Amino acid sequence: HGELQYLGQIQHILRCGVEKDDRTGTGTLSVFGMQARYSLRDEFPLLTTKRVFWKGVLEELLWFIKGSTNAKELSSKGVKIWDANGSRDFLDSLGFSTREEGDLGPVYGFQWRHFGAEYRDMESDYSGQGVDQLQRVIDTIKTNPDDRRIIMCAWNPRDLPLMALPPCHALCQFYVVNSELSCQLYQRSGDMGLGVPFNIASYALLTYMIAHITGLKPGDFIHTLGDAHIYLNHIEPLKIQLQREPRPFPKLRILRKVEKIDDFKAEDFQIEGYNPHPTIKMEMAV
Amino acid sequence: HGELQYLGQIQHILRCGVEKDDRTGTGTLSVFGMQARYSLRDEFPLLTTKRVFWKGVLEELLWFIKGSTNAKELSSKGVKIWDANGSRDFLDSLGFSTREEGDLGPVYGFQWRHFGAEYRDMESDYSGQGVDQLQRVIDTIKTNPDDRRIIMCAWNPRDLPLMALPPCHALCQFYVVNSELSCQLYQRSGDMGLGVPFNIASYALLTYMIAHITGLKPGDFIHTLGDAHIYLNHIEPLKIQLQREPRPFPKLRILRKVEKIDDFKAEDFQIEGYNPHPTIKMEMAV
Ligand SMILES: Nc1nc(=O)c2c(CCc3ccc(C(=O)N[C@@H](CCC(=O)O)C(=O)O)cc3)c[nH]c2[nH]1
Ligand SMILES: Nc1nc(=O)c2c(CCc3ccc(C(=O)N[C@@H](CCC(=O)O)C(=O)O)cc3)c[nH]c2[nH]1
Ligand SMILES: *c1cc(=O)[nH]c(=O)n1[C@H]1C[C@H](O)[C@@H](COP(=O)(O)O)O1
Ligand SMILES: *c1cc(=O)[nH]c(=O)n1[C@H]1C[C@H](O)[C@@H](COP(=O)(O)O)O1
């Protein structure tokens, strides 16, 4: 199976990791530099030893492509995952006391589509200005597949101080060989219990979406970690999930041919064959 | 030994890589996503199955920290490695026909120290403007070691079109645990025969330098590849080097305590125990 790599990384961070501190004040066992490789050929990496909130996964990605930064917008669809770092309290603690709730700042979406752009408020019109990496990437795959510079980068030094919470997935690169499209991710920081599972699915999905518009077959999703940690209050839970048998990865279908990455709607995607083991609750470290 | 990982990656790219094309028009066998880990504790990763131009290695890094972009300056010291992509011909072929030879453009050095900065000519004064990642990184290690955002990024989307040759080593991150400092590198593109060997040494050196000024012990250098290729005209050569026995990695010493990363001079470093196998000539793909 493929879900064994993930389990194993967890198995390792537990028997060889080291105690560390972090901004949350919570605990953490960590390890530096790790690499796993999931196959995207006729299967989707949606963990099974636990139930993943696929709804939030899909909504968030749609939310990113949009270029939005209002943690409220995603909340409107019923995905709370980002309301925490957009809250009034969390925002005031960083000296952003003059911002309106939900303004995450120049993060993900804004970087992907308007890199150059000069940020200022979560509801300004940034169309036409900035540099669109997401699109630049697509056109290259189409015209020049062999290029070794198909990179999309979220880490923008100039803007770091305005971000309510820096890009954990900081940079990804695509590579195409013999009709199939692959993608590698560099995740400087990984919450092995909450975000990672969500992250693996988000990039596998993005790959599928790209492959479809360019007419290629998805290949491999390579996941490279930096500080792969496990918050201390996650040890008991993960320890259970580690004793669960993995069932076959599901299959994801796109029921309607789309030719613009912006035409995608939540109804265009459907999953088949998801028989996950019951959910496992884990608290988020703020 | 540690040099076996490198050899092996070469061994792999040769019996499972795939034929590919590239801008140089030369050939290439490639593989996507690879990861090696070299230990920096009481040893320096200066390859032995071949003789590495340690002089150029050291000069180039000193050249980067400086923030220089004149391929001439480094040439003045006797390190030609960058005169090729700064040449009059190479520069005119990219439409930079109004630049003076040796102006690589907003590359490495300029990004490391003056990220924000608006480039314009290789001899303008960029002091005070831009954002200094190199220094930002150092102060963090000193004040807040647990930070999971100690990143230095060279990939700057806005400037790509001005660069005569984009950052192959695009991003690196530092992590500190129990008195030792480690560093991971993401190299989107790797010329397994020429640049990589040079690159592994350049980052191990930078780590040593940082560790010294912050008073820590060097730990691990993690090398993550993207398109790890082998130009076709390198196959015969590498095939020889692969049949050579590796001798112990040398040891590097800093003979004089320095407290500013800019105070470093070439005379502050000395290597001990380097018994490499004779040189191996390989032509550069322009
Ligand atoms: N410290 C920290 N870690 C992170 O991972 C993170 C993130 C990533 C987004 C995120 C947050 C919470 C859950 C989440 O809680 N997922 C639950 C399901 C919740 C539900 O049912 O709505 C899970 O167990 O997967 C899933 C994803 C933003 N800020 C963060 N800060
Ligand atoms: N295509 C391509 N590949 C690269 O690696 C590269 C670089 C990296 C710099 C570089 C170039 C050549 C040699 C080099 O020739 N090294 C020799 C020794 C040369 C000497 O003795 O002066 C070696 O065999 O190591 C060593 C390092 C810039 N532009 C490039 N373009
Ligand atoms: C950040 C966002 C994401 O998409 N995925 C993640 O796993 N995370 C995690 C990483 C880390 O646990 C925390 C951010 O902390 P820090 O800024 O790295 O200190 O969220
Ligand atoms: C680039 C610079 C460096 O320090 N190290 C490297 O190995 N290289 C190599 C990568 C690639 O072989 C070539 C650049 O080609 P491209 O821009 O990726 O097409 O130089």
Contact A49, A93 (CB under 8 A): no
> What's the A172 CA to ligand 1 centre distance in angstroms?
21
Q: Are A79 and A55 in contact (CB under 8 A)?
A: yes
If you measure CA to CA, which chain A residue comes closest to B151? A188
Cβ distance of A148 and B32 shorter than 8 Å: no
Pocket mutation for ligand 3, best pick of A59, A160, A191 (most atoms within 8 Å of C-beta): A191
- The residue whose two tokens read 């050929």 is A41
- Residue A168 structure tokens: 């954990």
Q: Collapsing DSSP states into helix, strand and coil, what is residue B172?
A: strand
Which pair of structure tokens corresponds to residue A271?
Answer: 């999953």
Q: How far are the Cα atoms of A16, A143, A209, A261 from residue A65, in angstroms, in the given order?
A: 38, 22, 11, 8
CA distance B151 to B155: 12
Paired with A176 in beta bridges are: A181
Asked if the Cβ–Cβ distance from A33 to B182 is below 8 Å, we say yes
Helix axes B195-214, B54-66, angle to 10 degrees: 60
Q: Resolution of the coordinates in A?
A: 3.0
CA A143 to chain CA centroid, Å, is 27
Site of tokens 């076709």: B232
Experimental approach: X-ray
Residue listed under structure tokens 């939030």: A56
- The residues of A whose Cβ lies within 8 A of any Cβ of B are 18, 20-23, 30, 32-33, 35, 37, 115-116, 131, 133, 146, 148-149, 151, 153, 155, 157-158, 160, 166, 170-171, 173, 175, 177-178, 182, 184, 186, 188-189, 220, 222, 224, 226-227
User: CB–CB of A35/B224 below 8 Å?
Assistant: yes
The pair of structure tokens assigned to B72 is 């001439």
Are A230 and A17 in contact by the 8 Å Cβ rule? The answer is yes
Alpha carbons B137 and A246: distance in angstroms, whole number: 41
Q: Do A22 and B226 touch (CB under 8 A)?
A: no
Interface test with B, best of A30, A155, A178, A225 (most B CBs within 10 A): A155
Cα separation, A268 vs A143, whole angstroms: 26
Rama region for A102: left / alpha / beta (φ>0; ψ in -120 to 50; rest): left
Q: Are B80 and B73 in contact (CB under 8 A)?
A: no
Residue bearing the CA closest to ligand 1, atom 7: A195
Q: Do B158 and A115 touch (CB under 8 A)?
A: yes
Closest approach of chain A CAs to the CA of B17, in angstroms?
11
Contact, A255 vs A268, CB < 8 A? yes
Ligand nearest to the CA of A146: 4
Nearest CA in chain B to A221: B33
**CB-based burial label for B149 (10 Å; 0-12, 13-18, 19+):** buried
Is the Cβ atom of B226 under 6 angstroms away from ligand 4? no
Residue A193, phi then psi, degrees to nearest 5 = -95, -35
Spatial contact of B227 and B266, defined as CB atoms under 8 Å apart: no
B175 contacts A32? CB cut-off 8 A: yes
Q: Is A168 in the pocket of ligand 3 (CB under 6 A)?
A: yes
- Where in the sequence is the domain holding B170, given as residue range(s)? 1-286
A281: CATH: 3.30.572.10
Quote the ligand 3 centre to B36 CA distance (angstroms).
24
Residues B6, B262: Cα–Cα separation, whole Å: 31
CB distance A169 to ligand 3 below 6 Å? yes
With tokens 């408020």, the residue in question is A121
Give the integer Cα–Cα distance in Å for B222 and A123. Answer: 41
Burial of A250 (0-12, 13-18, 19+ CB in 10 A): middle
DSSP state of A242: T
A194 contacts: CB under 8 Å, gap ≥ 6: A234, A282, A284
Which of left, alpha, beta for B245 (phi over 0: left; psi -120 to 50: alpha)?
A: beta
CA B24 to centroid of ligand 2, rounded, Å: 14
Q: Annotated active-site positions of A, please?
A: 168
Residues of B in contact with A158 (CB under 8 A): 115-116, 131
In whole angstroms, give the CA distance from residue B267 to residue B250: 18
SS3 (DSSP) at B270: strand
Q: Which residue from B minimizes the CA distance to A113?
A: B157
> Nearest Cα to B3, choosing from B229, B263, B284, B204?
B204
- In this complex, how many residue pairs, one in chain A and one in chain B, have their CB atoms less than 8 Å apart? 110
What A75-78 contacts at long range (C-beta under 8 Å, 24+ apart), as own/partner pairs, is: A75/A102
Cα B218 from Cα A71, distance rounded (Å): 41
Ligand number, closest to the Cα atom of A22: 3
Number of domains chain B contains: 1
Bridge partners, residue A187, by sequence? A169, A225
Torsion from C-alpha of B147, B151, B157, B163, nearest 10 degrees: 160
Cβ-nearest to A224 among B35, B115, B182: B35
Instruction: Provide the pairing of β-strand A180-191 with A217-230.
Output: parallel
Instruction: Identify the three-state secondary structure at position A96.
Output: coil
- In 3-state terms chain A splits into helix, strand, coil percentages (rounded to 5) of 35, 20, 45
Q: Is B274 helix (H, G, I), strand (E, B) or coil?
A: coil
Tokens 């990024």 — which residue? B153
Residue A279's contacts (CB-CB under 8 Å, 6 or more residues apart) are A50, A51
Helix (H) or strand (E) holding B177: strand B169-177
Number of residues that make up chain B: 286
* Cα separation, B165 vs B91, whole angstroms: 10
- Buried b or exposed e, range A2-40, using 16+ CB within 10 angstroms: bbebbbebbeebbeebeebebeeeebbbbbbbbbbbbeb
Edge-to-edge order in the sheet of strand B180-191: B18-19, B29-39, B217-230, B180-191, B169-177, B151-153
Spatial CB neighbours of A2, under 8 Å, sequence gap ≥ 6: A38, A39, A43, A45, A249
Task: Pick A226's closest partner by Cβ from B30, B155, B175.
Answer: B175
Is there a binding annotation on residue A229? yes
Q: Which residue of A has its CA nearest to B227?
A: A148
Residues in chain A with CB shorter than 8 Å from the CB of B171 are 155, 170-171, 186
* 8 Å CB contact between B86 and B101: yes
Other beta carbons within 10 Å of B244: 16
The answer to whether B228 and B14 are in contact (CB under 8 A) is no
For helices A195-214 and A133-143, the axis angle rounded to 10 degrees is 50
Among residues A228, A231, A250, A244, which one has the least CA distance to residue A280? A244
A35: Cβ–Cβ under 8 A, 6 or more apart, which residues? Answer: A222, A223, A224, A225, B33, B35, B224
Three-state DSSP state, A118: coil
Q: Map residue A202 onto helix, strand or coil.
A: helix
User: Quick check: CB of A41 below 6 Å from ligand 4?
Assistant: no
* Residue B266 burial (CB count, 10 A): 11
B123 in helix, strand or coil? coil
Q: What is the 3-state secondary structure (H, E, C) of B60-78?
A: HHHHHHHCCCEHHHHHHCC
CB B194 within 8 A of CB B187: no
Q: Is B94 in the pocket of ligand 4 (CB under 6 A)?
A: no
Q: Are B275 and B247 in contact (CB under 8 A)?
A: yes
Give the DSSP letter string of B220-251: EEEEEEEEEEE-GGGHHHHHHHTTSPPPPP-E
Using DSSP's 3-state secondary structure scheme, residue B278 falls into coil
Q: What share of chain B is helix, strand, coil (3-state, %, to 5)?
A: 35, 20, 45
DSSP symbols for A21-51? --TTS---EEEEEEEEEEE-TT-----SSS-
| Amino acid, res. A104 | L
Amino acid letter, B215: G
B149·A30 Cβ contact <8 A: no
Cβ–Cβ below 8 Å for A148 and B182: no
> Which string of b and e fits A63-94 if b means at least 16 CB within 10 Å?
bbbebbbbbbbbeeeebebbeebbbeebbeee
The set of long-range contacts for A110-115, using a CB threshold of 8 Å and a minimum separation of 24, is: A110/A67, A110/A69, A111/A153, A111/A154, A111/A156, A111/A159, A111/A167, A112/A64, A112/A65, A112/A67, A112/A152, A112/A154, A113/A67, A114/A67, A115/A153, A115/A156, A115/B157, A115/B158
Please report which helix (H) or strand (E) contains residue A135, including its range: helix A133-143
Q: Which string of b and e fits A176-195 if b means at least 16 CB within 10 Å?
A: bbeeebbbbbbbbbbbbbbb
CA distances from B24 to A144, B71, B81, B283 (A): 14, 20, 17, 12
**CA gap B9, B11 in Å, rounded:** 5
Phi, psi for B133 (deg, rounded to 5): -65, -45
Q: What is the rounded CA–CA span in Å between residue B213 and residue B135?
A: 11
Tell me the helices (H) and strands (E) count for chain A, helix number first: 8, 8
For A177, the token pair is: 């060989």
Q: If 0-12 CB within 10 Å is exposed, 13-18 middle and 19+ buried, where does residue B95 land? A: exposed
